[PDB]
């Protein structure tokens with residue numbers, strides 16, 4: 011029996027365009043009347059639970075509570091009082107969380123690197139790395155789209171934020187995309203979109219194809 | 235009684251990151267008791283109508299009722315009703331506005347044209363046109379960014395959307411950025427950003443400089 | 459009421475050139491005069507422990523049981539037991555620990571982008587390690603045979619490969635100045651992994667690596 015308070019990441023709120031606070035109560039006994047109400051410091055939130063998780067392998071139940079809350083309330087700093095009520099707990103427990111404040115804002119520097127020539131020579135799989143560095147407060151959402159069409163989330167993996175060596179305040183993040191050689195050889199202008207607080211547009215785009223390496227001012231070829 | 239309910243346009247919701255809805259009364263007594271109330275389907279109370287407009291010299295009544303509302307509920311299509319009653323007319327006037335439904339969403343196609351050679355020859359100024367076409371609905375926000383920071387609102391002018399001739403539902407929009415010729419010679423990489431509903435991130439980016447638009451002038455062939 | 463020990467990882471093995479044992483006791487309340495001993499699956503003697511701490515208020519006995527053991531004992535798979543005969547429980551408790559598919563890692567070095575170099579405040583060289591199993595790699599950076607300081611370069615934790623769940627990838631960067639890049643430097647990235655037959659691989663990139671080194675085409679105003 012434990013109660014968790016989960017602040018939604020900017021990765022979560024940007025994906026669905028909604029700040030969805032979520033409270034997990036884990037390892038509760040499988041009893042009846044599983045109800046999760048909602049309050050705040052004012053007391054006007056209303057929503058119930060949806061699709062409570064089944065019994066975990068350690069032989070106990072669990073419940074999840076999620077609600078829709080506006081973006082401006084999330085930016086205001088109000089402590090949202092997520093309350094969970096159950097019969098096993100003699101007293102219902104409520105959780106109050108809010109955004110951290112006072113953190114500096116540093117604009118991300120999204121630089122896109124083409125796959126290495128040695129990797130291209132092997133002709134099995136080519137990897138394109140999106141470098142997102144020099145951004146705070148180190149909460150980013152990086153996704154890949156092809157010709158304006160988003161790709162499957164399984165195709166790409168985004169690394170967790172890590173501290174920058176030179177800059178202590180700024181933290182970087184990484185994401186790689188695996189592509190076939192024939193797709194890269196033809197060139198579909200793969201682009202990287204990065205979402206962050208510090209960006210004035212809050213979204214930035216950088217693209218690369220096979221013809222980026224050529225300076226496009228001269229066309230020199232070697233034929234035997 | 236005449237009340238003008240101005241819906242929050244996409245430019246308004248995107249510039250301030252907070253949707254602002256205003257219903258403004260028009261052409262009544264210069265100053266008397268008035269009650270403005272935003273009403274949903276549930277009839278719940280709303281934020282107070284701050285900054286009521288002062289009486290105009292031409293004896294035309296005007297009251298600006300602004301409030302902060304849920305961003306997601308506005309896009310959900312549920313209708314917002316401004317209830318205005320006045321001492322002059324006992325019957326209240328109900329004005330209801332919402333985001334229109336039954337409208338197709340078409341992804342904007344952003345084409346960014348370099349300045350003409352004839353204009354660059356006179357060297358008095360350079361105009362860069364940001365062409366956005368095939369976007370629905372009519373609302374759109376266009377602003378200009380130079381090397382990461384936005385331009386002044388006076389510097390750039392965005393034309394009103396007009397119906398596209400080929401596609402009746404789709405529309406097109408224009409925005410010019412007149413700059414001095416010597417700035418274009420430096421190739422400082424002007425960037426055009428646009429905001430619209432249909433884009434996957436709701437915003438997309440295009441860039442132009444002196445290097446872009448230059449073909450391969452030199453096919454230097456080294457063949458043995 | 460359990461015992462936990464830190465397994466020797468190939469990075470830690472390669473740093474000290476030997477397998478070292480670290481048994482940080484967890485989930486056991488700190489009492490006076492506790493008994494902790496190192497034994498194998500069969501239980502012969504060990505060397506004396508070193509650098510143990512006092513009682514820990516956080517209910518986790520944060521004193522390390524240090525012992526240096528041969529490499530063949532670790533890679534043979536026979537278990538190691540951190541036997542902790544605690545005061546509260548007369549029955550001794552031990553934790554069996556050992557190594558748990560091997561794929562040769564492929565190391566590819568990506569030169570810094572021109573956008574990074576044009577701005578000139580810094581240059582980042584990325585070391586992409588892919589297709590290694592298990593997740594035990596130590597990415598280190600070499601410059602003309604001189605090992606760079608650990609603070610310059612940082613390596614992310616290995617993540618499962620999207621193409622193959624068995625495969626893992628690790629990615630590391632080196633933060634240098636633009637002058638250090640446009641001036642001739644080797645900047646070798648060396649990667650050590652168990653699955654490598656040589657146990658060590660490295661790649662080198664230069665400013666002229668991108669150039670074909672057949673035609674030096676230049677633009678002059």
Ligand SMILES: *[C@@H]1O[C@H](CO)[C@@H](O)[C@H](O)[C@H]1NC(C)=O
Nearest residue numbers: 224228229230231232450453
């Ligand atoms: C540029 O050079 C490549 C090298 O083979 C060649 O395939 C391509 O056709 C050239 N571009 C043009 C426009 O001819």
Ligand SMILES: *[C@@H]1O[C@H](CO)[C@@H](O)[C@H](O)[C@H]1NC(C)=O
Nearest residue numbers: 229231233450452453454455
């Ligand atoms: C450039 O030269 C190459 C020589 O191999 C030729 O194949 C190509 O068609 C040329 N491109 C143009 C645009 O003339």
Ligand SMILES: *[C@@H]1O[C@H](CO)[C@@H](O)[C@H](O)[C@H]1NC(C)=O
Nearest residue numbers: 665666669673674675676677
């Ligand atoms: C051509 O070679 C010279 C060697 O002195 C070098 O400095 C120069 O950078 C080379 N050209 C290019 C385009 O790299």
